Every structure is written in structure tokens, then in C-alpha cells.
Amino acid sequence: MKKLLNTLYVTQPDTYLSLDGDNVVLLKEQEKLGRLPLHNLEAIVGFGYTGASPALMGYCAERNISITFLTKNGRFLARVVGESRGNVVLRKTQYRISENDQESTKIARNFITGKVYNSKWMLERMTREHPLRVNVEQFKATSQLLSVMMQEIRNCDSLESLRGWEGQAAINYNKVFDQMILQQKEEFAFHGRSRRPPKDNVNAMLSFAYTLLANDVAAALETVGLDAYVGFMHQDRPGRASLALDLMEELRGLYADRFVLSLINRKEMTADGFYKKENGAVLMTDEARKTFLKAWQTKKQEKITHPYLGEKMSWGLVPYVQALLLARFLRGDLDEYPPFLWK
Amino acid sequence: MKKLLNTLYVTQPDTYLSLDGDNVVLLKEQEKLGRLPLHNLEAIVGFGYTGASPALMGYCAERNISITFLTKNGRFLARVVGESRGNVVLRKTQYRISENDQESTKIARNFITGKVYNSKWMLERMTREHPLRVNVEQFKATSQLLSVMMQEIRNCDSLESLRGWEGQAAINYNKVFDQMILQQKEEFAFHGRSRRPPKDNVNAMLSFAYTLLANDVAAALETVGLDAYVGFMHQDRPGRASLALDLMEELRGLYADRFVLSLINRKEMTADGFYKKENGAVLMTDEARKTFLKAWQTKKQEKITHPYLGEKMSWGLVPYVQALLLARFLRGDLDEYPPFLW
Amino acid sequence: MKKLLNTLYVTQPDTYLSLDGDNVVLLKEQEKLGRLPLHNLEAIVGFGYTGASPALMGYCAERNISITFLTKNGRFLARVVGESRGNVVLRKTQYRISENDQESTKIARNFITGKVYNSKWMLERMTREHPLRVNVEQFKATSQLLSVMMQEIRNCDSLESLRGWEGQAAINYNKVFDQMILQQKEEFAFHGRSRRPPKDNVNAMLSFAYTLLANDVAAALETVGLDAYVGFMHQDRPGRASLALDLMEELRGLYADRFVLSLINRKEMTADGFYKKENGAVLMTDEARKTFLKAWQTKKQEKITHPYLGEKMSWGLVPYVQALLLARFLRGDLDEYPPFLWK
Amino acid sequence: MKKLLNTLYVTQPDTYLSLDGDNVVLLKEQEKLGRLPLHNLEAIVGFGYTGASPALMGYCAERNISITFLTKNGRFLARVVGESRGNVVLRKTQYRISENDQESTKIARNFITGKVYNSKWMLERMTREHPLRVNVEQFKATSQLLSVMMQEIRNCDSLESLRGWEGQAAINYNKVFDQMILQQKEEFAFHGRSRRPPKDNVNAMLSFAYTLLANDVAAALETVGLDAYVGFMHQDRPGRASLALDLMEELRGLYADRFVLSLINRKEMTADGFYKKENGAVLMTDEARKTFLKAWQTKKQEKITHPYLGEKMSWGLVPYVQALLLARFLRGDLDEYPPFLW
Amino acid sequence: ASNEEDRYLMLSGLQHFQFCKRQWALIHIEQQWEENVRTIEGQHLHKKADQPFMKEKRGSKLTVRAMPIQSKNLQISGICDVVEFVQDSEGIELSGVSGSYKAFPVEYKRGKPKKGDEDIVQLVAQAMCLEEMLVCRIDKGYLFYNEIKHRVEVPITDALRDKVVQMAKEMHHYYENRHTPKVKTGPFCNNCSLQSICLPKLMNKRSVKRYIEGRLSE
Amino acid sequence: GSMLVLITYDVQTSSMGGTKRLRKVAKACQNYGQRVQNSVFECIVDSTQLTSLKLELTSLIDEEKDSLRIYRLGNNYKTKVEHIGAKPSIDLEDPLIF
Amino acid sequence: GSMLVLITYDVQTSSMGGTKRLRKVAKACQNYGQRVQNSVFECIVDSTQLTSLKLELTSLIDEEKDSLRIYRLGNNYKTKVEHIGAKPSIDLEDPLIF
DNA sequence: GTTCTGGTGGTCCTCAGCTACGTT
DNA sequence: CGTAGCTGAGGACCACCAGAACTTTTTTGAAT
Ligand code: SF4
Numbered sequence A, C: 001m002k003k004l005l006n007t008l009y010v011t012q013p014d015t016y017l018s019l020d021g022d023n024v025v026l027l028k029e030q031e032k033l034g035r036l037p038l039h040n041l042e043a044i045v046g047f048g049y050t051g052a053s054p055a056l057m058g059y060c061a062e063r064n065i066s067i068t069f070l071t072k073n074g075r076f077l078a079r080v081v082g083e084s085r086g087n088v089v090l091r092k093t094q095y096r097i098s099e100n101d102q103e104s105t106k107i108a109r110n111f112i113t114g115k116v117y118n119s120k121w122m123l124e125r126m127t128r129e130h131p132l133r134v135n136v137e138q139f140k141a142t143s144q145l146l147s148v149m150m151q152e153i154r155n156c157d158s159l160e161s162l163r164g165w166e167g168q169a170a171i172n173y174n175k176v177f178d179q180m181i182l183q184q185k186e187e188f189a190f191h192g193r194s195r196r197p198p199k200d201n202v203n204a205m206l207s208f209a210y211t212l213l214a215n216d217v218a219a220a221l222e223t224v225g226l227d228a229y230v231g232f233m234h235q236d237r238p239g240r241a242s243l244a245l246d247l248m249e250e251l252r253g254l255y256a257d258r259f260v261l262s263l264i265n266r267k268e269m270t271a272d273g274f275y276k277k278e279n280g281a282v283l284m285t286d287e288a289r290k291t292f293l294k295a296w297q298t299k300k301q302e303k304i305t306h307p308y309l310g311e312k313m314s315w316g317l318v319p320y321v322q323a324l325l326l327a328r329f330l331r332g333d334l335d336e337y338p339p340f341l342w343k
Numbered sequence B, D: 001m002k003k004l005l006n007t008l009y010v011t012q013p014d015t016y017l018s019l020d021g022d023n024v025v026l027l028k029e030q031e032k033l034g035r036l037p038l039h040n041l042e043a044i045v046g047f048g049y050t051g052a053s054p055a056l057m058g059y060c061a062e063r064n065i066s067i068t069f070l071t072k073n074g075r076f077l078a079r080v081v082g083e084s085r086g087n088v089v090l091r092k093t094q095y096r097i098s099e100n101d102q103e104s105t106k107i108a109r110n111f112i113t114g115k116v117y118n119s120k121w122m123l124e125r126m127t128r129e130h131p132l133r134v135n136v137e138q139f140k141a142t143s144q145l146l147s148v149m150m151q152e153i154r155n156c157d158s159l160e161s162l163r164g165w166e167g168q169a170a171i172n173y174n175k176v177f178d179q180m181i182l183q184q185k186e187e188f189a190f191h192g193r194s195r196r197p198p199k200d201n202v203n204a205m206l207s208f209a210y211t212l213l214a215n216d217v218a219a220a221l222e223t224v225g226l227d228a229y230v231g232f233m234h235q236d237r238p239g240r241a242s243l244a245l246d247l248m249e250e251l252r253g254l255y256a257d258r259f260v261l262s263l264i265n266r267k268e269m270t271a272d273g274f275y276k277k278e279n280g281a282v283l284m285t286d287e288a289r290k291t292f293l294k295a296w297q298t299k300k301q302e303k304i305t306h307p308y309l310g311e312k313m314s315w316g317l318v319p320y321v322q323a324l325l326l327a328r329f330l331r332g333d334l335d336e337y338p339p340f341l342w
Numbered sequence E: 001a002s003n004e005e006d007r008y009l010m011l012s013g014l015q016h017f018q019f020c021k022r023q024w025a026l027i028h029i030e031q032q033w034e035e036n037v038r039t040i041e042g043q044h045l046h047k048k049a050d051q052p053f054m055k056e057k058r059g060s061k062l063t064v065r066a067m068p069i070q071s072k073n074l075q076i077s078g079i080c081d082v083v084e085f086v087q088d089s090e091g092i093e094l095s096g097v098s099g100s101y102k103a104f105p106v107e108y109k110r111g112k113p114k115k116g117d118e119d120i121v122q123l124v125a126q127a128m129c130l131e132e133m134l135v136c137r138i139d140k141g142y143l144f145y146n147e148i149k150h151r152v153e154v155p156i157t158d159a160l161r162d163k164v165v166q167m168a169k170e171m172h173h174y175y176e177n178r179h180t181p182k183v184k185t186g187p188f189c190n191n192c193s194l195q196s197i198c199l200p201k202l203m204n205k206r207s208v209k210r211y212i213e214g215r216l217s218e
Numbered sequence F, G: 001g002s003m004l005v006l007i008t009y010d011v012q013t014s015s016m017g018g019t020k021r022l023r024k025v026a027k028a029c030q031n032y033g034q035r036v037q038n039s040v041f042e043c044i045v046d047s048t049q050l051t052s053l054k055l056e057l058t059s060l061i062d063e064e065k066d067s068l069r070i071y072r073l074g075n076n077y078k079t080k081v082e083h084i085g086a087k088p089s090i091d092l093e094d095p096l097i098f
Numbered sequence H: 001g002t003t004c005t006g007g008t009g010g011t012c013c014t015c016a017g018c019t020a021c022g023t024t
Numbered sequence I: 001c002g003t004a005g006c007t008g009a010g011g012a013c014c015a016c017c018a019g020a021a022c023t024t025t026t027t028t029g030a031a032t
């Protein structure tokens, strides 16, 4: 819960928070489930329909601690704080760096380097896992191509070059992704990619996964103090959460497509739940979306290890914590922002 | 053209605020004290140890209703703040206008111009109704010298200058404040605006008025989408939460000091309504607090006419409009901020 | 049930009434109880909560017969008429006669002669009935005086003279009245008349009787259309029914004083039912008042004969029939007003 | 100064008007059809076979709520009349005055003067707003005829002379009453008078209007305190509402037949509604009756200004206030009775 | 006049005659009545405070309700709302009890004390009336005003008594003449409950002849 | 005048004479207005009838156990009343013919 | 405007799904106002919130089976309300010092 | 035909109570 | 904790049945 990052991540639903002396107590239906100190904490994030003992609220407000309250799943509800601390300077720095282009180019090239690393290693593991019926040398050649592209992106200096060298990898990934899946390959196809109302079932279910990750990343930004509607690589525009999209593109790897292949394979999803209305639209059936959301929650419960921090956690906390490091970049404690990087 | 909404004060300790649909209900060990619909509230203020249901905080934060927590003597604690709702270009403009001393000193010019105008004209008004009690001459004296400072403030280009002039308006008015009272002078410990933050009598009401006004102006500004308690005008020093009230430095001197003085002069508060601790702190009785809050709401209800267009407007809208105009200036439609001048 | 002088009174309560062919039919819960021809009727008077039948209402209102609906105790409720309404020439005749001395004195003579005859005959009858407890000489002397007084009043022509004779007759009867009571003289003693704030028991009782009788007679007049507020002997003033007081002189004695003396002598009540007042006034108790009303109602069902026409009828119809005759005097074949000369 | 209470028309046959406290209830073989509070009524009109309980009529008589019974065509079959009240001054005055022929003339003067003025002024209103539709100069000639004749009527002395002049005016006005079928076909052409059977149209509406106006004048006159069956004019035929006829002689022209002409000219009624039996004169129709009564009760709520009393009052009150303006004349608070001179 | 005991006028007429010399004429000669809000309230208070057949005593004084009274000198009869008897060896013994009591009349009303005499006159009659029956001398009166729930003492002098006598004489004259006069109307007939009868408007307006002649010439 | 006035009552039948009070209040209030829904009536009255009805009900009920509310809509009520369901109420200003 | 309107409902619970309709109607109507009596609420609204409430409440009930009435007083409602019993109602212009 | 007082049953109405869950 | 869905447990509210009766003086009563 209490990560090395100075936040509290109480995620068990229907818990309670109360105050004992100078420490927080997590009550689990009227017995002392947990006890934590408050001497080194900086912010508290609370999931679930719960409460806080007003003594805890009063003790947190004075000593520069913000109490953020969400739902269980991760939607954003409210924030409690006195004379606001740690938002004005952070947001002003965000806007100042948004004005200039050199730092924006640096950050965007960092993100694209992370994405290409993730995809290349995903292909490496995919060809290692099942070396029976797969084009191994083709995937190796694509791997060398993306290694050179990774070096070039690390050698980038302008936004236009970054956009040009990003756009190239899309079609290569599209073809290799269509070749990637193992089970039910005959039954589902990925010949063409469409962002606007989609054709093919796989594209639509990618769209749904993208929307879920969208809501998650938006809440991830909102819970720390940064904006939503001005981005670094994507240009500013009224009504579009550009920073959200930038982080989406950074994390569109393991967290989205691996879930796609897992749902498609293992015969956990069937063709009876997918439909067609005159334009390729895949109207998700209610049972299909119920199973999808249950599977998403189950996956979020899966434990992994952070590549950078090293601390064991859930999948559901992977975005927020990652986004939180972004804040520690804008506060001057970090030199860069590696999501998945060697350095 | 907006209309004022009510406010709910909670004084009973160990209560609980809970949500049901669109109603706020007060419980205390499952005893429904009452339920109020939330479509005609503007803010909610609580004393003592009162808790809220996280659904309620989410609802209020989403729908522009401000929750505030207080303790005994209005010691501010735990404001409820929501999220970023959009209009990003307005924030872009406001963030660009800061850290540039030209526009900053223009806005400081207008703010302190409004403050000085209100103080001087109120003093002249008070010497105009009843001249027998005090010395008109000296009062008139102070007037012209403040008028003098007015010309200076208009011929200003640097922020570092105005702070110094602040001290003058902070030392050329206190000498009048002690003579502001008429009745009950001997009972009410009246050492003027000589102040002490842990409270030393006849300052409890002053601090209470300041806290209420600060919360009101903060909510009124956040409705439009900007934060100015430490912004372009006021110093970068943390913990000096006054610029939000400096937008109401046109109103801090007027609407709070005037209220305290009217209560004192109208003999409506008796010296038995206060007490002092063993160590020396000063507190207010519960009945006196209820009287103060009733008077504050009744005054805030009274209806006046705005100088700009004259559409008949109410007092609680005085902060809100001052926020709204500050938007229209940052959109570039006007030339400079027109402050509130009475 | 009974038809007297071309009028039809239905005195028994709770008997519906309807039309059949060209005849009136009485009913009592689907039981044929009476059939009467309507060829030669002049009015209909009801006493029950009947309601009549709309067929008969239309029939009579078309054939110039008005209907009057009362309550079983004689109070006036409503009068259904068409164009005629009947009493126009009669009321005009009354109003014309009300402003001349000759005719008014004639009618006053008709009233007073009946009054004195009734008083004298009652005195002589009581002398005859009871020997031992009577000063026979006083009563016989007053009887001779009253006979001469009646013979004189027959030949009066001026209002003041008739008023004086009425006063003298009243004085004679009053100075005779006290010894009429033959039981419970302890507190029941008559020694004068004080109508306003009545004093000392029995006086109040007498007053009450008069009121009831007056009201009864009042309703009687309204049955035929005589204007109850314009008198003949008594002069008209607003708020008082002068003609009722004129009429109820002849019926005052035999029908009120006899009733009161019967109540007193038969020990029908005791003085415990009269409460006290500080100035000497006397009032009645609710229980005593209700007993008085019940006794009056029961006496109203006594069956006697009619001295002038001979039909055997109840006491309760005496004020109406007489009143009817009064009307037949104003415009009819009556030679002179017939008083209630009842031995 | 009154409120012009409503009025109830019951048309469905075989009902029964019962009373429950202050409510009038319509029963029909124990089935309830409705109930109305009796403080919101003025008159209750019954059609066909509708019986009344004695309690109901006894309650309605004492509060000047009139009850009327009609068979099929507004006949005078039966009304209700209550007791007499103790106001002998007015009744004595009226009877004595009616015993004097000179006062009879001094009242009939004003009655017929008001009548002819009504006729003339309405004829001129009709002429000036209608162009080629009517023979204009014949109307004009009748107008100066009436205007000169009114002055001569004003100085009449004996009843026979006034009757002669009234008859002359009546014929000389019917001569042009025969001329208004402006916007309807020939079936609404007046061709004289038939008394008992409405053998034609127009009569079948004028009869209804006259009955519904008589039953209102009588109620008003018996409400004010007078007796309504002795008159200042007419041959005193026994048992007829003579005073009601006298007081209607003024508003008949401007309140009933003007209404029928307005109804016809607007084409609110169609000749298909009427029908006829083997002889059957002319009988209206149930929907036709409903339309007549709806238009009547709708027009009875127009607000005018009264000529003499100078007040803004509703149309339906006019037959009441006039009667009241009669009463005070009998007590001598005026000089002579002012008739309605609309 | 049955025995001269019938030609009596009620005490309720005095207040009406004092207020609107037309109002007494409307009520007591034409025998008609009409109620508005204030009249309803007054009648309801009078009815509720009416509790006959019961006496209330405090050992020293006695109170009587609905006390019937009459006076032959003025030919005036009526009902006193409350009579208070006090104990002292000064007055006249009265029927029913022992001891010697003095009398005080009390009459409740609804409304503020009026600038004109009005109510006083009525009360005075009561006091004087009582002197005829209880053969004594009365020089005090009590008025209770329930709108302020206050109580006011009222002295009596020869001025008030002579005014009452003259008022009664004039009232009897008007009654014998069957005549309803006219008064100066002003704004008091805005709560005159008989405003739908006495018609103040026609009292000031023009003669009838001018209006008829006015609408005759044109 | 004829101002529109709305009367709502609410009595308690758990006490000694609850049913008697309910019966008497319903009968006393039905004398002036009509019934639109259970425990509510709407009437068209003048000022004097309103005062009389108020006095009668105030005398009849007992305090501290019942509830009674009286609203008044003024003389412009035709544009202030809206009905949706299926319990129509007879109005008393139209021709009113049965 | 922030002016007062009064809302009354009457839904039958003997029909097929009457209990559910009653529950949903009461819950929907309690959001925008205050309960003064059983089946009688009063509330302070503008035009827009009133339109929203009317559109929301028109669908929960079913026509030809229920009744619903909305009365509208005006902007000066303080002088058009009387209370006699023992069911006091909280006013929302009173300073509300809980 | 009303009017008042009991008795009966059947339907609106709100609260106390137990189960089953919270993403688009 | 909030949002729904099923129960039940009493009160509020009103419409039917059943029974037993059903009559009372004269004066007071507002006005910013
Ligand atoms: S005008 Fe009105 S108040 Fe004046 S005396 Fe006549 S009725 Fe009374």
C-alpha cells in the first residue's frame, strides 16, 4: 500500500480510516486491520465507498497532506486540502514547459523510446514463447529495424522528425500484430486498422480497451495535480486531454494488446457477442461487455513487479504510480522520465 | 444575472453528513435530524468534528458547491476542492500575465486604488452623518491625504513601490479606527485594530468576518476557474493567504469592518457573550455566534444597485461579479479591471 | 290523512307521497295506505320528511295548487308555487285593513270576546269541579263581572276603549289566577307579570309556553300567506310578528295556562330544575326544558272535537285551522271572524 | 357590490337533488353523479322529472338560493319561494305607493323612458357599424322618431296614456327588428309572434332567453327585500310576477334579444339542430341546449362600467344593482329611480 | 306597547348610533345584517366568552355572565356581558347570597381604543341602567380590548350621563319617525359591514334630474 | 373576490378519539370545497368564508396532535394549476351544466 | 426566480406493480423538495429545474391509473401560507443555524 | 329523508429489515 | 456507504351497513 513513493493506496473496498494518536488505522468491519505512521507521508489516495474519521481529516489538513477520494474502480470523486500546496507551482511549470518546444520534444522522444522498447521486447518474448509455427527470422529482422529506430529516436531533436519516425512503426506493428495471435487466427482478422468507428471485431475491442485505459489515465493525472487538456507531444486543443493521449500512447503496449490476445486466445470470448450495423460497427453484447469488465478487474488484481522501483504491486496501480513519477519530474527531483528504459 | 443561494451551518458536534439522491441528511448515531435538498445550496460549513460521505464530497465538488470545515473560532481547515473543468485558454492567459511585472503592477494599482477609495469615502461618510460625536476636522484631514496617495498610486509602474505605500494606508487609517466606536467603549476592550492572532477581545468578531469573507471569495473565484490567493499581485510568500481576499481588499475593509462596527454601535452584542481561557485566549459564546450568523445572512440578503449598469443586484454577488469581470478583462474585451468603488 | 276545508294535512311522519292517475297516494315503505281525489283541493300541507313526488309536484303546480312543506314540529321549510303563489289579493287586503280604525277594532273585538268567554267558562268549570278548596264566592263574582264585560266589549268602536277593557279583564283573571294551583305552593306562587327578565320560578315557565305557542301560530299564518309582521290590534314595529300576538290571544289561556297548571298539579316536575340569578331572575335547566318540550309534544297528540265545525281532530291542528278561517275571512264568504269559542 | 355566484343547470332526467350538510348531491337510483358546495351557487335549474327533498328546499330558501323547475321548454311550471322577512318598511311603502296611481305613473315614466332609450341607442349602434348590409336611412328616421318621442313620454301623467305610447314605440321598433338576418339564411326570418307554441325559429330562442331572464329578475327582487308580485304598472292580473316584468322591461332589449341576434349572426347555431314533431311547434336539441347555455353563462361574465353609480361591475349583476337602486329611492335617498341607460 | 314594557330599545343600538348615524338606522329599522371578517371575529369571541349557568368567585368578589337588565327611565333593555360584585359594607345586598356587594359593569370588545367616544357611551348606559335595578349609585366602568388584551378604566360624570340621555331621546325620536338620515361618509365606510347596502357613493353625487337631462339633450 | 384556497389536513387515529376527529374534520371541510385527492381539498372562497372555515376547523381539531395547512393562490389561479393524472376535478367557473 | 411550487401525488398500490411505482415516485419527488405532509411536498425552484422535474416525473407514473398535481404560488410566498397544527416545516430562507 | 354514533373491511403510505451488489 | 429490489407491520383514509333519534325564547356583532 504505502509505496516508497510517499502516497497511500488503500484499495480494499468498504474499509474505514480513523485516527489513533498520530497514526492512521485501517478498520476492516470494526477490528484493527492495519496501522501506519504519518510522519513521512505526503498524500493519501483512497479507493472505495468508505469514509474518513473527521479526526483524521483534521489531522491531515493542517500538516500539508491532501486527502483524495475516488471510487473503488478508479473514477475521481473529490479532494480535501486547506491552503492548497503542491498544485499551483506544478501546474504553472506544466504550462511553461507546454509553451516551449525543446523540452516538449525531449519528453516526447522519451515516451516514444519507451514505446518502441516495449513493443520490441514483446515481440522477442512472443517469438521465444512459441518457436514452433512462427516466422522467427522475420521477427528478428523487425527487431533489428526497431532497434535502429530506437537509437534514432534517442538521437532526435525536433517535433517533426519525431512525428515522422513515429508514424513509420505503425504499419509494421499492424502487420506483425496481425501475424502475432495464435488461437482462433482463422476466425478473427486484423488486416486493416481504423481509429474512428471501427471495422473488424479486434479493432473495436482495442477501441474499448483504449477507452478504459483512457478513463484510468485521466483519473491518474487528476489525482496528483497536473492538468488534462494541454499535452507535450500532442498539441493543445479545447476538449481533448492531450497529456492523457500522450500517456496512453506510452502505455499502449503490455497493458492493452496482451489483454486483447489473452481474451481472443484461451477461447474465453466467442463470436456470438459481436454484431454489425451497416458500417462495420461491432456492437458489444451486454453479456460480452459484462465478461469483459470482469476479466479487466481480474487482470487488474494480478500481481507484477515495477521495472524501475522494483516493488511488487497490482496492475491497477501501474498507471497512477507511473504518472506520479511524472510529477516528481516536474518538481525538479528527476532528470528524465523513464517509463520502461535502461539508462 | 446569477441568483444567490443559501448556506448551511452545522454547530452540533459529532454529527454526520450523508447523501441520499440529491438530499443532504444529518445523522448522529442513526437519528435523522433533517434533510435539505442540494439544488438550492451554495456552500456548507461545519464546526467541531463532523464527517462527510465521500459520495457527498464528490457530488458537491462536481456541481459547484463548496464544503468548508471550521473549528471553534473559525480556524480554517480542510477546504473541499474539485478538479479542472476546462476553459484552458483562460488559464493560459492568467498564467502568462503573472511573472511579468507590468501587468502585475497594473492589477496591483487597481486593487489598492479600490481599497483606498473605499476606506477614504467610508470615513467621510461616517463623519457626514453625525458630526457631534467626533472631530470632523481631523477626519477631513485624513481624507485629503488619502486622496493625495490616490494620485501617486495611479502614477505607478513597479510592484515593489506599492507595498511601501501599503504601509502608509496601513498606518494612516489605524489612528482613526479606535475612534470609530460610539457606544459601549469602556466595556468592549477597544485598543483599535491593534491585533493579536490568537485573539484578545473585540477581535473575535473581526477574525470571524475575515474568515467568512475569505471562504466566500475563494468559492466565487473557483466557480469561474482560477486561483488567486497567492497569484500575480500578492507576494510569493507561502502562508500569506490574502490575495484571494485582496480581490476583496475592496471588500475586506468594507464588508467586514463595517459589519463589526454596525453590530457594536447598534448595541446588539453584550459583553457577557465572550469569555477568556486560563492562558489568555478569547472565545465567543454559542448564542452570540448564532446571533452573528443570523445577522450576517440577513445583511447579505439586502439588495442594492451596482455602479456599472445599475441592474438591481444583491450583496452576496459582490465577490462573484468581481471574479466574472476579471475573466472578461483577461479575454481582452476591456482595457483594465474596473474595481468596486463605494 | 285528514281533509279540513279543502286542505290536506299529513301529520304522521315518514310517509312518502306520490301521484297515481289523477289522485294523491300516501305510502309507507311500499305499502298502500291512502288514496285521495285531487278534484277539489286548494292546498297541500306536509309534516314529514316525505319529499312528495315530482309527477305530483308538476301536476299540482299546473292545476293551481301550491305545496307547503313544514317539519313534523310545525316549523316552516319551503313553499313550492308556480306563477300564482295564491296570496296576493289576501295580503293586499290585510295591508289595506291594517291602516283603518274601524275594521281593526272589529277584529280586535272578535279576538277579545273569545278570550273573555274562554276565561269565564274555565273559571266556572273549575268552580264546579272542586268544592272544598275553593272560595266559590270570589269566582262567581268575577264570573258575573266578566260576563258583563264581554257584553260591553261586543259594543266597542274605539281602540283606546278596547285596550282599557282588555287591561281590566287581564287584571281580573290575574287576581283570580293564583289560587288555581292546588299543589306545591311552597315556591310556585303567582303574584304578578314580569315578561322581561322573569322572576321567581313559575313566571318564567309561563313565558316559555307563550313563546312556543307564538312560534307555532307564526308558522300557521305562513301556511296561508298572511304577512306575519303587520298586526291588527297590536301596532306594527320591525322585528316583531304583531299579527301572531294579535291572534294568539284567544288560544293563550286554554292552551298554555291549562298545560302549565296540569304540569304543576300532576307533579310532572319540581322546582329543583330552576337555577338562580343574582337580581332575582329565573332560568330553566336543560333537563327540565327537554321534559317540558316532550310533555308539550305528547299533549299535542290529544284528540278533541272542533266547536265550530265538529270534526274530531288533534290539538296540534287548532292553531292552523283557526288561522285558515282567518284567511277565509279576508277574502271569502265568512260574515265575521270566528273565534275559538270552546266550552 | 357582489360576486355573481354561479348557477347549476341539470338536464339529465330522473335525478334527485339531495342535501348532505351544506352540499347538494345529485343521486339517481342510489348512484352518485356529483356534489357541489352550496355556498358557491345562486340558482339551481331543473329539467324534466327532478325531485327535491324537503330539507334541501328548506335550506335553499333561507339563504336566497333559488330553485326552479322546467319541463322541456322553460315553462313556469314551478319555483320555490321561502318565508317572509321582517322588513315591513319597504313592503308597506311599496303597497301604499301601488295604491296611488300618480306614483304609479311617476315610476312607469322612468321604466318606459329607459326602455325607449335602450331601443334607440342600440339601433344607432347597429347602423353605424354596418354599411350596405342594412337600409341605413330608414334606421336613421326611426332614430329621430324615437328621440323626439322619449321627451314626450318623459312628461306623461296617467297610466293609460303611458300604455298607449309604450305600444306605439313597441310596434315602431318591431318594424325594424324584423330586419336583422345579416349572416344567416331565411330560416331565421322573423314573421311575428306566437305565444304558446314556438312554431318557428327565433321564437324558440327568444322564449328561452326571456324565461332565463325573468327567473333572474325575480330572484334579485326577492333577495333585496321587496315583494315581487305587486307592480307599479301592467293590469294587476292576479298571481303573476308583475314587478319582475316591470323591471325586465328595461334589460330585455339590451340583455336578451341582443344576445340572440349576436348568437345568430355569429353562426354559433345551425338550423339542423332544431326539429319538429307531428305538430310539435319547434323543440331545441340537447347539444343545441348545451351550446345556448354555454354561450349564455360565458357572456354573463363581461365587465362594464355602470352609468350612474360609476363602478366597474360584471354584466350579470346589472339586474341586481338596478333593483337595489330601486330600494333606496323608496327611502328617499335619491330624487327618482335612474333606469339603466346603456 | 303591551304595558309600556314593550316599547324598549336594545343597548346594542347605542354604539351603532354613535358610529354611523345611518348604520343604526340600517340595522334596527330595516332589520338587515351583513358580516365581514371583523364582524365574524367579534361574534365568535362574544359567543365563546358566553358561559351562562356558571359563577366564578375568589372568596372576596363574584362574577356573573349574561346579566339581563332593563331601565324604565330610558326605556332601554339589554344584556350585560359581565357584572363584577365586590365585597364591602357600602352597597346593596342582592338576591341569592349573603354579604353586601358593589357593582361594576364589564363589556368586552375587539379592536383598538377609538378616538371618538363610541364604546364609552354604550358602557355608560349599562352602569346607569344597573342603578335602576340594584337601587344604588354607580361611578365606574371597565372596558376590555382583546386586540391589545388590555383593560381600561372609565369614569362617569354628569357630562356623559346627560349626553347619553340626549342620545336616547333623539334615537327614540328617529325611531318614531321611521326615518333614515344621511351623514358625512369619508373613509370610514371602507370597513362598514353594510357597505353593500348604505351606498356612500350616491350620497355625494349629482341629482338624478341633471343626469337624465344630461343624457336627454345629447 | 373568489380567491382559490387549498386546504390539507392530517389527523392521528392512534389516540382516544382518532376516528371521531377524522370523521368530524372530513365532514366539516367537505362543506366548503371539493375533494381532489385523499386528505386534500381545493375551494373557491371569499375572505369571510375563509375566516369562518379557519375558525371552525381550529375549534374542532386538537392541537399538538394534528396538522392543517392553508394555501392561497390569489385571483390568477387559472395559469398556476397543472394536472397530469386521471382523477379530474370539477371546476366551478365554467357553465357547469350536468 | 427561485419561487415556490407545491406537489402532490396519489398512486394506487393495489394494481400489478403499484408498490414499485409508489416507491419510485416518492424517491423522485423527494429529491427536489421537502415533505410537509404524507403525499404532499413543497419546494423552491426556478423554471428550468421545474421543467426538469416535471419531465422526470411524467414518465414514472402511468396515466389512466394515478393522479399528480402541481400548484405554483409566486415570488412572494411568505404571506400565502398558514400552519395551525403540529407538523412544522423548515424554511429555507431562515439562516439555518443547525 | 337527515344526522349522529358505532362497527367492519379494504386500500394508500412510510418506515424497519434483509440481500445483492458498484467500470460503459 | 449508496443504490436498488423483495418483504412485513402497523397506522391514516374512506366507503358501506345498522340503529335510533329528529322542536328551545332574547339580544350582541367590525370601522388603520
Ligand atoms: S356609509 Fe357605510 S359606514 Fe357610513 S353610515 Fe352608511 S353603512 Fe355605515
Ligand SMILES: [Mn+2]
Residues within 6 Å of the ligand: E046, E081, E107, E108, E109
Ligand atoms: Mn361585548
